Amino acid sequence: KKVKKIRKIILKEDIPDLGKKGQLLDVRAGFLRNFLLPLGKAEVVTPLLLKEM
Amino acid sequence: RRICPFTGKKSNKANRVSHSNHKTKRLQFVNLQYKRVWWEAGKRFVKLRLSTKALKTIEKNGLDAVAKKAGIDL
RNA sequence: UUACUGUUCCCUGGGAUUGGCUUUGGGCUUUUCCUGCGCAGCUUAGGUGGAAGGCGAAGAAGGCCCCCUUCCGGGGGGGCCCGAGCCAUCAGUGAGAUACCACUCUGGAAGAGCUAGAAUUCUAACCUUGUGUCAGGACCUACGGGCCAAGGGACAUUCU
RNA sequence: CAGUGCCGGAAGGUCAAGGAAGUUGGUGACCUGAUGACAGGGGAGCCGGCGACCGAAGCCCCGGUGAACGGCGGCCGUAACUAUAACGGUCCUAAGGUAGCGAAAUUCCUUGUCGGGUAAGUUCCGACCCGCACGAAAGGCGUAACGAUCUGGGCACUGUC
RNA sequence: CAGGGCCUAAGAUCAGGCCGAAAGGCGUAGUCGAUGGACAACAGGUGAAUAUUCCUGUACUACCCCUUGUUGGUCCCGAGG
RNA sequence: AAGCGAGUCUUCAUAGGGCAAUUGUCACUGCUUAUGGACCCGAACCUGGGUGAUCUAUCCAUGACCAGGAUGAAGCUUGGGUGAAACUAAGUGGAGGUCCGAACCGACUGAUGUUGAAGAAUCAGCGGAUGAGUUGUGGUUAGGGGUGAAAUGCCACUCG
RNA sequence: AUCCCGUGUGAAUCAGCAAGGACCACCUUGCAAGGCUAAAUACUCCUGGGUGACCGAUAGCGAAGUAGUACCGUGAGGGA
RNA sequence: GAGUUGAAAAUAAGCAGAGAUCCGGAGAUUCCCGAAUAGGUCAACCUUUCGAACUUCUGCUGAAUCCAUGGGCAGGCAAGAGACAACCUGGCGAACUGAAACAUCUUAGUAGCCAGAGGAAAAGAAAGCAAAAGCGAUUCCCGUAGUAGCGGCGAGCGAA
């Protein structure tokens, strides 16, 4: 019935799957929370950091 | 209690209407749930008990805001 | 009680907690190529448009042969040989030149995308375990905290 | 193993929420004709309804399963005197009571017939059998021992008489 | 002599911990809980009502006081029992 | 109903019909109705909250008790027989939900009792009596619940 | 319709948003998801003042003297 | 402003105008149980180094990564913990009953139980009501209205 968020991110260290610290692949919500944010292996796309870095 | 630390989401008092319109009582309660969110400010996990709505909310709004709006940590 | 209406236990499907792949194939996509014997005929007339020059040495007509389709009428097509042409109102035909173009519908194939379906899969949250580990003035083989273990694995558990 | 239960199948059919191609309806900028009185069709968008197809278990369906729930049939004929039928024909179900026991804590009619016991016993024991309606783990049949058990006849003993 | 000042069984209450409309439920170390384990008194007198309690005689246990020494402690602890 | 209005609805219509074409009010006192326990007395019952295992029903801990006699198993040992036993007698041995029987526990027959001496006794008999036994002190289990060698019995003379 | 809640998706903010009894337009009102605030108001185990077409000894409080007493029940509780 | 040492009479000595008895405002003491509070506990008791646990404040500062922490340790101060007649708010929330039975409904969100607080509480300053006219935070009484409406369109409930 329903799909869940597919949330943009930006990286902090190379991904063995999608990109080497540059790409913006909208990973998944069930993925940013554990591997990406626990392991500090990603940063969420804040509109604040974008236009200042 | 079955009360979300981060929102007063209680169970719901709701009668389950049947097809003959026979109303039982059927207390109806939130899917607050055992997880362990990674509190960045300590680089470390904390084990919480979270109404999923509140889980979505921390993510949208960050964690520490939710924290002070309920005053929970440590 | 196999009377009526329901509740609970239990079983299943949808959503939430819920994630990595990399494939198989169902339904939409989007770019890559054949497809055609109403009859008057240069003769297996594809409809609809731009429509007077395209196509050539980043190398054709022609014949020597390979393959595939087939109504054995012929069609697409690799190789080599060849080396100065196959071409348009030139007339037929409801509709035009195999000069050429956008595609395209007649349908058919594939790498490209959505959401599923299925399959195995690993690891981050989940369940479970641990005489193991260290301690706080003492232990915690007094439940339990952190820590790494080892199984399990997005299934189960819970919530609707 | 017919019905039900349970188990294993689940190929096909019915199969809910839900998902969903379309389709439909309202509202509606601007549009259009008439005596008098007002409609109609209608961009967008916003709200509705119905919905092809998809949607698991379940049930239908298919097999195993009775120390799982339970059930175990009638009518009509013939044999060597007459009879009773060893044996046959018919509708039937899923099949038609096996072994043992039997008028039985189960037989109504019924103090059933017969034998023993008694002077005389509707009680009692042993048999026969038309078991109204016994019967195999709601077990069948029988058992030595045991019973403040129910039941019949004894000897001794007595105011029970 | 009996109990408490010692110990713990069944059980109870349980800090913290977990769970739950509220009360409260489950639960660990602890704390209580003896009907049990440790621990030291007998005879004879007296007398209206008490006596293994008062009296006489002889005993026993615990803590001090005195002497000589060793200087080495008591706890938490690991063991026998 | 819009509406019209001494009329209006029904209809082609007066037609024809239906209803209209007018009335007080306030209070006190009675009657009666309505809601309230509603004239008084009387149920078995239902639901919520709490108190109950000193009776009794299982269990747990920890103690205590069971006169007196009888029988006599298995084992073990001797007169023995079989490369090896298999069994016969003796003796020791002391078993048994064994035997007879007091305390103890409980209830079967009979009489007394039935305004009892006693809300189930007394008397004469009666069963068990080392066991699936009794009993003492502390505890455990609860009202659609507890416990139950199962009667729906017991849960403090009260229990479908 | 408004009004608060469980599950999941999950807007805009003033050339906006909500209400005006589905919904859509136009108009009118009010502008959410933060908080506080006196009075008029219901009450009596009580205190003070007053009143009674209220009782006056099985009535009035159950209680006109050691009345929640004696007594009864293990207990809650009953109760002269 | 005089006589007095509570009820009833002595009793024994007292006290008082160098204010007794007495009546007021403020004080002081207030053994033991009881929130009960030093620890246990069968309440008004025992053992006690004399004194809870929760906040708060000041200091020591476990665990892993001496990080940062929280937890623990201590010296602090002294504030919360109990009580309530009825009224109130919140959570949970029945049933007998009425419907001449009864499952929707009604008794009713009443009773009761738990949790707070006040002398009152709750509500409250407009994303309100209205209706081409106006209002202006809440809360109560009257009245609209037993009307509109809801309703096995039944019993009945009943606004603004």
Swiss-Prot record, chain A:
Belongs to the bacterial ribosomal protein bL9 family. This is Large ribosomal subunit protein bL9c. The chain holds residues 43 to 95 of 196 of the full protein. It is found in: Plastid, Chloroplast. It comes from Spinacia oleracea (Spinach). Signal peptide: none annotated. Component of the chloroplast large ribosomal subunit (LSU). Mature 70S chloroplast ribosomes of higher plants consist of a small (30S) and a large (50S) subunit. The 30S small subunit contains 1 molecule of ribosomal RNA (16S rRNA) and 24 different proteins. The 50S large subunit contains 3 rRNA molecules (23S, 5S and 4.5S rRNA) and 33 different proteins. Component of the chloroplast ribosome (chloro-ribosome), a dedicated translation machinery responsible for the synthesis of chloroplast genome-encoded proteins, including proteins of the transcription and translation machinery and components of the photosynthetic apparatus.
Swiss-Prot record, chain B:
It is found in: Plastid, Chloroplast. One of its GO terms (cellular component) is ribonucleoprotein complex. Keywords: Chloroplast, Plastid, Ribonucleoprotein, Ribosomal protein, Transit peptide. GO terms for biological process: translation. One of its GO terms (molecular function) is structural constituent of ribosome. Its main location: plastid. Transmembrane segments: none annotated. Component of the chloroplast ribosome (chloro-ribosome), a dedicated translation machinery responsible for the synthesis of chloroplast genome-encoded proteins, including proteins of the transcription and translation machinery and components of the photosynthetic apparatus. Belongs to the bacterial ribosomal protein bL28 family. Component of the chloroplast large ribosomal subunit (LSU). Mature 70S chloroplast ribosomes of higher plants consist of a small (30S) and a large (50S) subunit. The 30S small subunit contains 1 molecule of ribosomal RNA (16S rRNA) and 24 different proteins. The 50S large subunit contains 3 rRNA molecules (23S, 5S and 4.5S rRNA) and 33 different proteins. This is Large ribosomal subunit protein bL28c. It comes from Spinacia oleracea.
